[PDB]
Amino acid sequence: MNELIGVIRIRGWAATPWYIQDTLSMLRLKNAFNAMIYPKDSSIQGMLNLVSSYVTWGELNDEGLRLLVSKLEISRGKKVNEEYVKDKLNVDFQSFVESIKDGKLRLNKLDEIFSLPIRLHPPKGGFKGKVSRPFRAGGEFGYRGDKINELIRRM
Template structure:
């Protein structure tokens, strides 16, 4: 039996705008679904995704997201196709009991992605392997308290690049 590799889950937030972005970086950000400033996606930290994150490192910030923060993002910023809010009733229709259950399942690696994009057949009595019709990105507000610097990396006092679990504090300031 082959063991399933569980990669860490990362929140990736685009902090820099569109006009001066080189084409190759813009294409990478497009693949990550980060098409506008202050949008966030939650990705699985596989080697190919980490390569894309490293390539766009000067336009984004990223780190490990925890289940509580992800549940709060789903509650407050989750949107369905048609720009409707993600509701508890929608989750329950697909077999999930709460936002926290979805967040824990994703962070623990039980499900591989949050968004399906379309209706996914679920067996009777089982929950869906993701949230159908959920948009694969979250639109956030600019952070309360502002940013330090969009030209420096987090390790030297700026806001760009890898910030580890401290990404959760930034996300809470942006909700």
């Protein structure tokens, strides 16, 4: 049981049922191909089992985690007074962490907890590189485990 998972919304928000759309707003996945990092516990698991047909998730390792945090852009950094400030350096981390987070005074000490809506790109090489359907049970949606790390590298 790894301690940190990443979830990606792989479908758009048109004609999505009442129950499902509200759960994905609490997980911060409003539209397609934005990702979010959460700790693995029984409370989040029951949420993913409800919206399973719209997301894919699994356990991050060092290469997948390091790669998600680097992708931030001008409207994609963490809530540095909102503004989603693109990190790109420790300069934003030498003055922002002094409010809620602790022990993070260097980009190499940003490994612990939380994030914001990470906006991604569709996957290189065809989301149908080996599949034909993001709509099929486990054909492309649902839990995939350690395989979530090579999918992040593509996007």
